[PDB]
Amino acid sequence: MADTFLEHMCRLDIDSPPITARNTGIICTIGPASRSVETLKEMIKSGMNVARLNFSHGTHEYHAETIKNVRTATESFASDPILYRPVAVALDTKGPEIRTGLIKGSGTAEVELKKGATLKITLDNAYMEKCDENILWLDYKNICKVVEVGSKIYVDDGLISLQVKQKGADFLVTEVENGGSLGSKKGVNLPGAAVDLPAVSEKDIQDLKFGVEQDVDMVFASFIRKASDVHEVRKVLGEKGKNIKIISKIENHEGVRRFDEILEASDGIMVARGDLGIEIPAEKVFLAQKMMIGRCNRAGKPVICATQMLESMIKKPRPTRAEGSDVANAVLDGADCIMLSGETAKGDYPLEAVRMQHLIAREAEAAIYHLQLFEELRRLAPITSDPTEATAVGAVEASFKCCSGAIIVLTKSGRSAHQVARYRPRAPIIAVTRNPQTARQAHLYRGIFPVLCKDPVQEAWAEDVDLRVNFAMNVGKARGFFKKGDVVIVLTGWRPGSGFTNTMRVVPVP
Amino acid sequence: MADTFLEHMCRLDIDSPPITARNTGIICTIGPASRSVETLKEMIKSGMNVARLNFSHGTHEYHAETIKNVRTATESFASDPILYRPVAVALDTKGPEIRTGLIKGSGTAEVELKKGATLKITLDNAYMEKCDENILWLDYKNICKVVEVGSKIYVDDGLISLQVKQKGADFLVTEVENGGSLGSKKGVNLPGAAVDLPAVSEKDIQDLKFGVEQDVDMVFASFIRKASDVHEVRKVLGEKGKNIKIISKIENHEGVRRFDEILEASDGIMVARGDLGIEIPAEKVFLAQKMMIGRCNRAGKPVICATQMLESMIKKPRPTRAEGSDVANAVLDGADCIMLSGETAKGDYPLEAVRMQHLIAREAEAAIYHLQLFEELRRLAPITSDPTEATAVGAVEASFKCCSGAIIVLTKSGRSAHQVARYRPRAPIIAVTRNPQTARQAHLYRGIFPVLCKDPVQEAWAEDVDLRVNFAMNVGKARGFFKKGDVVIVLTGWRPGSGFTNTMRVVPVP
Amino acid sequence: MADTFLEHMCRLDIDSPPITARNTGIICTIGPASRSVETLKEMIKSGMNVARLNFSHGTHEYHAETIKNVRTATESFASDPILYRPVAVALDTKGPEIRTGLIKGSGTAEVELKKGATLKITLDNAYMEKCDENILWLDYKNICKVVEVGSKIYVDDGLISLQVKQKGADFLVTEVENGGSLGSKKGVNLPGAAVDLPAVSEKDIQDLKFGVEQDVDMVFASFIRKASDVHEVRKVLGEKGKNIKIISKIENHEGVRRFDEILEASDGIMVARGDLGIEIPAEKVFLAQKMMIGRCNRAGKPVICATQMLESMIKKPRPTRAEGSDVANAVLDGADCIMLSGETAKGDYPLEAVRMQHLIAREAEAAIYHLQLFEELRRLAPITSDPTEATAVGAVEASFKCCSGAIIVLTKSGRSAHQVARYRPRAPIIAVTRNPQTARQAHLYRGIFPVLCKDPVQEAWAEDVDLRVNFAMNVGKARGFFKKGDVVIVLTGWRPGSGFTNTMRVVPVP
Amino acid sequence: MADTFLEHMCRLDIDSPPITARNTGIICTIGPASRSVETLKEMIKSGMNVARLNFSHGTHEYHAETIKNVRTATESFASDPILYRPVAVALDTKGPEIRTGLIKGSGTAEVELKKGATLKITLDNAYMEKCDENILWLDYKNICKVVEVGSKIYVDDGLISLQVKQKGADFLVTEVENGGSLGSKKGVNLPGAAVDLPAVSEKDIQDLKFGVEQDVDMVFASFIRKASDVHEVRKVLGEKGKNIKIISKIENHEGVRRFDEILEASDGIMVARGDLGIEIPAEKVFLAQKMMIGRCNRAGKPVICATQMLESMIKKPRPTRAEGSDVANAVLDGADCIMLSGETAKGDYPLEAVRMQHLIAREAEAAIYHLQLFEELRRLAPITSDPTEATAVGAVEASFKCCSGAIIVLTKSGRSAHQVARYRPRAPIIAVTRNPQTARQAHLYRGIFPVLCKDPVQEAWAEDVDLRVNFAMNVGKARGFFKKGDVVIVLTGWRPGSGFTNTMRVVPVP
Ligand SMILES: [K+]
Ligand SMILES: [K+]
Ligand SMILES: [K+]
Ligand SMILES: [K+]
Ligand SMILES: [Mg+2]
Ligand SMILES: [Mg+2]
Ligand SMILES: [Mg+2]
Ligand SMILES: [Mg+2]
């Protein structure tokens, strides 16, 4: 809108209402607070696009029923194919974690840790359910190999910290620095160590194969360190799960250093700030986020900002001021998807969290300085002569001039719609598809609003197109994206077949 | 290509050969040296696109035969509809000129004028063919009304200059400043004065009506001062000449000050540097040129740089260094058409002049900094939601990415093709049309390479399009614009009818 | 560093260590957890620059001793004038707050509020200490004037919310939306309403006059609605407190709408997100922040991002991921000062909070895209011919070319140094001053590192300058800003006197 | 001034009068029409800055007296040291030219050449003064070595052209293409050939040594092909002529290809369009000009646009429209100096040509888009930490903000002033110097207006500076550059000595 970024900031207006559409994808983690079919229905209406299953906790039976509930709540809306919203299922792997043992005692399963006190760490399975003030167990077998005297051991997602004083053959005497209440099977981080667990562990092969059987849409592979880790996960999914999108989670120092080879192998990225903020200094996480989002935008691949975006909303019904700014800034940085972990999995206000996510994202979109964003994306794009790319850039450029309410894209594999999203247009991308997996996986991309055409293929191609285009027109009028008499962009082929979406059309809305 | 204009300059390369296509239109004035049918044939092959007829000199009989010869030489190539080049006819009006009388004496019709001597100017028709050292006649009746003591009177296109010492009721005693040889019926300019002749004079109404009868494509209306002058010319052309394009010539101070209202009324503009450089100081003409070309580019209307671009080539076979740089710079400024006046009308080297025009223009196109040109044209464009505009910008944006050999545009009125030219793409715009006037008038716009489809309308619309598109493909292969296997942009409608070219298509060349 | 903002993001590097200097000012609120002289000493070393006193709670006796402790801990370091860091005192006024009455009952002073229940609000002072489930008192007299049916009333800093169902003459029947435990004299916010309390209330006149007596450096005036509110505060401070800087806190909708007139009157701004996030929707606070920071940067006036930047660090020793990104982004937005409210006032980890503030800020500075920031600031600056401005821009431009370790500025009033900070140079601005208040107030400006020259004025001006310049050279070597042999910029006058710093000098470091 | 280059063009105004100062240097070639002391006086007042002596024609006696007259006419104004303008002398070498023999016959020394006829070229000195229709002599001995069948031979600066049909051992039979009148000792060009004459020929060593003896300021070395040619010329000038600036003339294809190594060795460049436009195609000369001017601006070295800029003004009192635009565009391209060859050397209107040069240049300066020019020059500058560079950029940046009437620079060698000119400020650079050669050589740089301080060195350095600064203030008021009360930039040292101009000062004009 304005000639400089500084004037663009100065022009930002609280009283200027945002567009009804919301481009940024929302990913909610399912758990105790959101597992029920009636709650899942409300989360879908509130704005959920992808349900994340965290395989660091549940059994296969538990997760199987969580999937069952999600599809019940999803297909609840299928009676009306206009207002039907696809909902993806995502399997977040355990990965090479270090979790502690269980706690001994009555009342509750917790014990205090004084600042300055001693705590012996052990690998002996006799203390596997007898962790307390003095002794502590953890499942990583080679912990004495990778650790030295003075090394930090962070327990329970950063809260508690320990410095190693002495070593044994298989035991470590440590001194407590940050106190607090220890619990059962809390996560442990070893910043400075080189943890040598397998990227695809024995448990993870079972969880992935289960993912293929359950027909999940994507896999959030944890603690990805290098490009070979992504190919290991690709192999385990194999032929049958070839179409399952692999999103590499960057959770550690090694993963940041090797980001380019990891991005090359992966379908997308998750900036998993949780583990990253322990493994790397807290100041710096933003550097890593902005870098990874930046490179993913340039590469044209989905990137997900994740964890602790609305942490206070576990306990409270409204977010903090910092949590408000974090979500907005992640969207302004250019993140395709925002994520909620504990907020929806085990929180007292799951629905309010999903709505805040929707609300902030929706006018972070408005505050994007599109003039500069689009200018720079063209320059930094390679000079390939793929007809689908050139149509996409034409569509996006066309959309900025005739302030379009939408860009409608007929697509089988999603790729035609992905390439439009790559250039970050202001208008939403109504991706029309008969492939239901394509509709679900499209949530990963910023601004793609998938719609599933359940209708049978009409005889003539020319009339089959017009049905899918008019189907999208009806969805756009229904959602408020545009009205009768407005202008929109339409992307179709020349005789059908996945591979050549080469036709842009500026159509008046009927 | 490069990140800054300065590096763009530094990168310019004499050894890098230019593209075979030449986007800038060439307008040649026809006269004694170029009137013959065999010479007109060679000028068309050398690169002529518009033939200009100067109605300050010829009779209606004379100009009628000049038109006849142009169409003979043009239709000479019509046997091959691939290599047929349309050629426009343009009628340049007399307008409110001030010409002197004839000269007395034997030997030749010329007399000397010393610096510092006296010259009496008279309106008495007894001296109408007796102009000499002492007395001089001129056809402007109210010359004593608009002139005062100290006013400059420039005779013979700037060469000779006079300062007014005394006044009479109908005579002026002047003193000579610049000497030289006076001649018969030379043009007179009155810088500082406000000449009150009619914009559409009595003679001009005859010449315009003749223009309509002869079926000319455009009118270069001389000495346009204000917007009402353009509407007077529009009226005289009337219903029958409604489709004749009016190009307002800016020849004077008043015309520059009122440029915006004149541009609004006119179809295009000519920066007539000849009279402008006398009426306004010589330094400043470039300011006026760059301004008018700039505003015309922003308005999306044709602009023509004109007169004295290769003056030395009247006498010599090669241009001066300044004349080389002038043509290049006019193209770099963003002029749609370059013009030759005396160079082709009465010169010893008409063909070499037209070829230089072609040669310079053709790699001025290459030196355009398109990165900046296209960026700035988008910003300065209004945010209209006309479907034809948004398709045009999409086409042009698409053309920069898949380095297209051309942008093919099916168009009846030319408007679909005009709107593509407005955003100055690098590739040539092959405008396919059945209307032969549309083909001729399209030369006014930068980069539009019109082709006339003489074939009858095929039955199905879908196959009628494919014939016109494949016709353009054959022209492009013939001219070297592109080859088999290359990519091009194609613009068509959705069911035929002039008003909605709304379909962009990235097609491989068959 | 890079040609585009997108490549600049992509280039950001966690492994690239930051510059030793930290440009962004840090403001800590003093209270129970940080009031002691030994804790204040550690906060100064950790990075405190301004001590904020919140006059909504303490008595004048209480705050007087807090000031006494701050100056004791500050002057503790005065023995070494090289490593002495000035520390400002700031008085944050009560302003037009709306607090409830006291609670009835034994044990503790609290009652529950169910979601959906009824609560009658009253102005009758008989219920002034009898607030409960049914009745609630509050000190705002005209609450029925500014409120209508459907208006929200937020109690206890956002936690509890009420919708107005009915109205009375002086009573309001409301329905509860967000439940929770009500308490004694909790703050109330009225989103939508136009609260007509006095901007400078009766209590505030006492607090301001006390501020003048105590010799505070700045006043954070709360709930500033319009420009006249700033002039009221200016008057109360009067002649004796003329040099006390007024920082208008934007806490409400009215204040955002009138931002430009408020900024014109005020010396600086605080984006008080606390009250702003209740008064305005939570999504939107970032819009208001970015706007106010943007306009303050363009105006060349201090702006302070404030409240809830590290809220979790009240309870925990490390911040959340969102809190890390919030501080970085506020610095990237261009905030001069970051602020801690509860984190230092009543938290379990005051020192760790001040260190995080220092750590994040310090490499947010590094991630600033200075190429674009400086380009845009020049364009958006007026074309004034003040000699001090032109020297400042020259200094800043010079600093980018000879990668200067610092820009040294001799200044009495601080204004010469303020104008250098206005153009946001990468290097720190070592402002040398004999006025001790100038040194303290300079913390408000980004990158000004004040140093107090306690030495007496040496006889010759030329040698007096060289003493102050060499004093700064010694501070710069001490702090690691630069070393012997490096280059720095130096700003001095031409014969001394506050008003003309007109001399830039590129000096090698001795 | 404006946000885009396109709006900048649109904003250009004929009625907006230009600044009184004229930044672009003017170089006039002296000959028959301008050799007299009274004419040289008028040319100096009209705007001459450098007198060029063409050593392809005169004897050493002839040129010695031309120099004598120039210094007489120059020192004529020395009585008033305020209005004294230094005037450089420049020696343009013969270089490896190919000139023909003399013509046989009475009446005049000319013969006709028909198109299509035969002309035998010979190296036999018996035909050295017997060139005619059939036989032609030329001084290049190895002409048969470097030429083949089909090679073009251009005679008399492009007018006449010949194609080689046959070869001999030492004779060539050719066919005429372009006719015209041949003359005595006309220049010959061999485009496509690799002419192997010495860069510093035997005659050139005499002319250079003479140049050193006469105390010329610069040498325009002709036909520079590579970097070694520049070092040969450097050697011949040697110790005694070490301070004589070498300006390499780019006249040929080889010189353009090797431009970077030539620029590295040379002090400046001349885009000698005369020979370049024959050696290289006429279309393309502009490419070569814009490239060379661009790279010279980036390198910070003088560049001179030359030959045929006002060719018609040899015969006529006013230039053509193309010649007007050429001078403006060369200045807009960024040429430091404009040059007149035949226009002043042997023309009927020398003074009018020098005035047009002055007039056009002077409001080409105004039409420069400085916003973009300065932005891009900073980015493309290396990040060196020379204190003189950083002061220069500071000065130039400061000058844009406080719309300075001038930037005053005290300089001995000129280098402090050269580095200010490198960043192309809008204001003129008043370079104050006691070295009279420094004053003369400073004309090579755009916008440096040298003034010679003839006064003796005053005792105190601080008062010696103030004398030179106040001397410049008086010159600026005299010329209209600024008035009493205005602001200007001043550049001085810290204790005198050539090597450290490190002090910028924004001074009010007394
Ligand atoms: K996990
Ligand atoms: K005419
Ligand atoms: K307060
Ligand atoms: K020469
Ligand atoms: Mg994580
Ligand atoms: Mg004309
Ligand atoms: Mg507050
Ligand atoms: Mg030459």
Author numbering:
A (entry chain C), B (entry chain B), C (entry chain D), D (entry chain A): 22 to 531
The authors write:
M1PYK is the constitutively active form of the enzyme and despite the high (96%) overall sequence identity, M2PYK has a low basal activity but is activated by the allosteric effector fructose 1,6-bisphosphate (FBP). Each subunit of this homotetramer consists of four domains: A, B, C, and N-terminal.
Histidine and serine were identified as activators (∼30% activation) for M2PYK. The X-ray structure of the M2PYK/Ser complex shows that the attractive pull of the N-terminal domain by the serine side chain shrinks the allosteric pocket and results in the formation of a hydrogen bond between Thr41 and Arg500. In this active-R-state conformation, both the C–C and A–A interfaces are zipped together by a total of 20 cross-interface hydrogen bonds.
